[PDB]
Ligand binder design. Structure first.
Ligand SMILES: O=C(NCc1ccccc1)Nc1ccc2c(c1)[B-](O)(O)OC2
Ligand SMILES: [Zn+2]
Length: 256
């Protein structure tokens, strides 16, 4: 099936998922000089104080920290959004080297990794229904640069040994996602898609301008994960990012 290798990577996805060459695919390069400030954009509202994390899962392409989304516990609203979007999971994309790893780029600059906090529009009832709608998901993207350690990320780094291979999961309760947010919530926003198959065009992207910094030891642990399942040849989970896609007929808006 699809993956990030030379024979099943991003350049091959369109064969099974034709929407890969669609009109609103992600990620994209954010040209900071061309993005336009939109004074009508409302401040973003990130309400994670009641977040209830449950489990962490290695799904063969990344690791997802899953949350209880059966009630409005952790939600994203405001900004370009109409309505309430519930946090369901977060995951990262990262590189084999500190100079690459993010999906979105800023003036062609690549960051070491990119965090995606995934939320679905409650007016659609469940995640599966939401991904079938143009305004079904809101994904908050946060860049990671290598420098100082991020204390709020250490609990995630420490449990990775327990989910080294595809299909492994571990209990992961009481994790506070507020510890992964930068100081500023200034952002860029545009309509796009999931960045892994099925590449559905159901995402309002909100990418924060301020990156968070993580230590080299922290990202090294990400790179020790495996794409393969236990007992299979070891393939390190690195470079699980899709490159920038054509912007086509879209405008990126800035909140600042
Ligand atoms: O959930 C995904 N696939 C499986 C699936 C389940 C249910 C219905 C349809 C598909 N993919 C996916 C989900 C969320 C995000 C991304 C990819 B992302 O853009 O990297 O970050 C946000
Ligand atoms: Zn992602």
């Amino acid at each position: 099936h699809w993956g990030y290798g030379k024979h099943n990577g991003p350049e091959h996805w369109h064969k099974d998922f034709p929407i890969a060459k669609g009109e609103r695919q992600s990620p994209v390069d954010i040209d900071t000089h061309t993005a336009k400030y939109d004074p009508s954009l409302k401040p973003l509202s990130v309400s994670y104080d009641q977040a209830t994390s449950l489990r962490i899962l290695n799904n063969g392409h990344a690791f997802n920290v899953e949350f209880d989304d059966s009630q409005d516990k952790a939600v994203l609203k405001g900004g370009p959004l109409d309505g309430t979007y519930r946090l369901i999971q977060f995951h990262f994309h990262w590189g084999s080297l500190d100079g690459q790893g993010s999906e979105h780029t800023v003036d062609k600059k690549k960051y070491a990794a990119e965090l995606h906090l995934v939320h679905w529009n409650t007016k659609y009832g469940d995640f599966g229904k939401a991904v079938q709608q143009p305004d079904g998901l809101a994904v908050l993207g946060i860049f990671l640069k290598v420098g100082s350690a991020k204390p709020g990320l250490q609990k995630v780094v420490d449990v990775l040994d327990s989910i080294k291979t595809k299909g492994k999961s571990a209990d992961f309760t009481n994790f506070d996602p507020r510890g992964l947010l930068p100081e500023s919530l200034d952002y860029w926003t545009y309509p796009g898609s999931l960045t892994t198959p099925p590449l559905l065009e159901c995402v309002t992207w909100i990418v924060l301008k301020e990156p968070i910094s993580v230590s080299s030891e922290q990202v090294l642990k990400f790179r020790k994960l495996n794409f393969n399942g236990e007992g299979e040849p070891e393939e390190l989970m690195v470079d699980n990012w899709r490159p920038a896609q054509p912007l086509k007929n879209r405008q990126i808006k800035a909140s600042f």
